[PDB]
A paper describes a structure:
Threonine aldolases are pyridoxal phosphate (PLP) dependent enzymes which catalyze the reversible cleavage of β-hydroxy amino acids (e.g. threonine) into glycine and the corresponding aldehyde (e.g. acetaldehyde). Thus, they can be classified into D-threonine aldolases (DTAs, EC 4.1.2.42) and L-threonine aldolases (LTAs, EC 4.1.2.5). First D-threonine aldolase encoding genes were discovered in 1997 and Liu et al. showed that DTAs are PLP-dependent and additionally need divalent ions to be catalytically active. Based on homology models, these enzymes were classified as belonging to the alanine racemase family (fold-type III) indicating a different evolutionary origin compared to LTAs.
Here, we report on the determination of the crystal structure of the DTA from Alcaligenes xylosoxidans (AxDTA) at 1.5 Å resolution. The crystal contained two molecules per asymmetric unit connected by a non-crystallographic two-fold axis. Each protomer comprises an alanine-racemase-like domain with an eight-stranded α/β-barrel (residues 32–274) together with a β-strand domain consisting of residues from the N-terminus (residues 1–31) and the C-terminus (residue 275–379). The structure of the AxDTA dimer is similar to dimers of alanine racemases and involves non-covalent contacts between both subdomains in a head-to-tail arrangement. Clear, residual electron density in the active site of both protomers was modeled by a molecule of pyridoxal phosphate (PLP) in two alternate conformations: covalently linked to Lys59 (occupancy ~40%) and non-covalently bound (occupancy ~60%). In both cases, the pyridine ring of PLP forms π-stacking interactions with Tyr187 (distance ~3.7 Å). The ion is coordinated only by two amino acid residues, His347 (via the Nε atom, 2.2 Å) and Asp349 (via the carboxylate, 2.2 Å), both from the alanine-racemase-like domain. Four water molecules (distances from 1.8 to 2.3 Å) complete a distorted octahedral coordination sphere. The metal binding site is located at approximately 5 Å distance from the aldehyde group of PLP and the manganese ion is nearly coplanar with the pyridine ring (0.4 Å out of the plane). The role of the essential metal (manganese) ion is most likely to activate the β-hydroxy group of the substrate for deprotonation by His193.
Residue numbers in the entry:
A (entry chain B): 8 to 379
B (entry chain A): 7 to 379
The structure:
């Protein structure tokens, strides 16, 4: 029937890309990748960047080319397109619960070098049974609660027991701890973040010491996000960093204070067209909730003081034109910074890659919608 | 040897064995909602043109048409393509189309199907005529009027009249009437307030239609309405066509409206989620977060579990608070969640697991997912 033309062709000026589109500024992205890897290298810790941020095997390949020690995925099915692209060192930074999931994990563990988290005795036993059935081996990290109050163990006896059992069980190798504090990532001041990161590191170190004193090596302590890796890398406790959003940035992370040694550029935008100029004081954009999420608020208009993206609907954004500011014309194309990287990536099937205002390529967000 | 991802669901599966998270449709509730909306429209002798933006699913639109819907609405031109591929050829683009590639695609769509579109801008009306002329196509044009939402739409008599006169005179365009959509009244909570605001919206639309008629221009269609307002819009004597979308499904934001009148809808749309951690007394963690259901209107609700409150929502986790006295779900238990907002949740998924009496019937393709160009 009717064919849908691609939104962008290599060689197109950005202004001719069809909207809304998710756009990557390649030089900013590349600089962010280098900066995070250099930070890890400086502190002699590993970087295992989180693929949930972008769900894009081409991006993971570029991270690995710069020295990343594998990637993280949050869900077992999310790993499949990365393995298809030849990426075979993957940490599932989550617990895996459900018969189909553990069966799939067993197959993944035969095809690749996999680790997973556990925080539950029953699940550790389910994991062992599934590995044994699959003829597979997996590394196991015990997840500890360091203050987020999501998943993770919070008592010594349970950490010790899970580690002892992973050691004794066939198909399982005890590899260390996952210690991730999600809430600290967006505490605004560096002083606030540093204080909570110090406490998270102390908790993780205490569990690692408990294990060591019981004769169990605790070789990996992994965790950290884009807001905390400034501190986690220097803790002398974390051995591996799991930052994901750093390559892109968004307006929520943008609101943090970044006046220390580690800073990232905006590289990720939603391109949108002005499609109504209905009254003085406002214009309407064609990018709404279906193109960028708003659990953390609306997107921000990039490089346009005076324009304020206000109400967001399904397929419309209401932009207020502040008094004194020039209203954009009908058909004008604007760049928006999403408020939150990962859920925005998960709305799109393709990423338009730009350099010097010209389209270079379109990369496949091949793991979009893989949450099983 | 590439690793195959098994389907989440197969016909015959018990619901509890469906892999999670999955978007699930209760077929009997859905069918009841479809019938109730079509009956409401027929009772008031107005057309129903249900909005496909809600579900992006050609199978659902086919079922709406089979009950007597007069075509469908789409919000974006590219969203229409999978519906045309499924044989649907009466489509209203309930939005303005701006941008050279969009207008070119609209030209091709208008050759393949009977299309209407909205305009609120003189320059764009001229662009639309040019694009139709270039495509060799004809399209129906509705002038969008602001009836109180303050989004798009014209708000002065002179412009409504000029646009209609020009659509009549321009090649490739046929003036078909008015789009009058009040999006913000839909979730005003009391029926008393929705009714009052709907009466005023109807009066504004009627006054524009009157203006056109008095100037010798017929105004055949006045289209608008959403799930929250169609109780009142159908009975207005002004609207000729209703554009409700969410009614087939419902969600927790619409659920918070007062619904104690003659028109009510059942919950038919759920996100199925597994308990994947039981880390402390008082909470469990679900495997459905923002990547499976959106939260611009708040978190989803746990269906049928009074003492379980879905609290914090992350990317791939939901923190569920177990109320004092309530029974915490076991590890691996499967729960149904009602999304806070239908359309953006549908847009996260590629397939819809269709269930009847606890048994999987089918999986329908959400074929227009991600089509916002
Ligand atoms: C397990 C895990 N590691 C790392 C991160 C870091 O993510 P980001 O740097 O994108 O904030 C997250 C998300 O918060 C996470 O859940
Ligand atoms: C043009 C248009 N018509 C109708 C509706 C009603 O949609 P729903 O009934 O799903 O709320 C909307 C969005 O709310 C809309 O944008
Ligand atoms: Mn995030
Ligand atoms: Mn909606
Ligand atoms: Na072992
Ligand atoms: Na005409």
């Amino acid at each position: 029937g009717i064919a849908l033309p691609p939104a962008a062709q290599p060689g197109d000026p950005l202004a001719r890309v069809d909207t809304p589109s998710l756009v990557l500024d390649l030089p900013a992205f590349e600089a962010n990748l280098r900066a995070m890897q250099a930070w890890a290298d400086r502190h002699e810790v590993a970087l295992r960047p989180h693929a949930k941020a972008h769900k894009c095997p081409e991006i993971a390949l570029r991270q690995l080319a710069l020295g990343a020690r594998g990637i993280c995925c949050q869900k077992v099915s999310e790993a499949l397109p990365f393995v298809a692209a030849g990426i075979r060192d993957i940490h599932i930074s989550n617990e895996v619960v459900g018969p189909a999931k553990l069966a799939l994990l067993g197959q993944l563990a035969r095809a690749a070098k996999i680790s997973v988290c556990v925080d539950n005795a029953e699940n550790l036993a389910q994991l062992s049974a599934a590995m044994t059935r699959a003829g597979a081996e997996i590394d196991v990290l015990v997840e500890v609660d360091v203050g987020q109050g999501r998943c993770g163990v919070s008592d010594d006896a349970t950490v010790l027991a899970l580690a002892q059992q992973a050691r004794a069980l066939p198909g399982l190798n005890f590899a260390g701890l996952q210690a991730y504090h999600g809430s600290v990532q967006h505490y605004r001041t560096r002083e606030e973040r540093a204080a909570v990161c110090r406490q998270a590191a102390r908790i993780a170190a205490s569990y690692a010491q408990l294990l060591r004193e019981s004769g169990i090596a605790c070789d990996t302590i992994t965790g950290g996000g884009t807001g905390s890796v400034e501190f986690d890398a220097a803790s002398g406790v974390y051995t591996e960093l799991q930052a994901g959003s750093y390559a892109f940035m968004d307006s929520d992370y943008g609101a943090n204070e970044w006046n220390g040694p580690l800073k990232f550029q905006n590289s990720l935008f939603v391109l949108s067209t002005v499609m109504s100029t209905p009254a003085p004081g406002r214009v309407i954009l064609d990018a709404g909730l279906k193109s960028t999420t708003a659990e953390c608020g609306p997107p921000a208009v990039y490089g346009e003081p005076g324009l304020t993206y206000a109400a967001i609907n399904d397929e419309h954004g209401v932009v207020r034109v502040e008094p004194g500011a020039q209203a954009p014309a009908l058909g004008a194309v604007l760049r928006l910074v999403p408020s939150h990287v990962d859920p925005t990536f998960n709305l799109h099937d393709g990423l338009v890659v730009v350099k010097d205002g010209v389209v270079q390529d379109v990369w496949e967000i091949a793991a979009r919608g893989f949450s099983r």
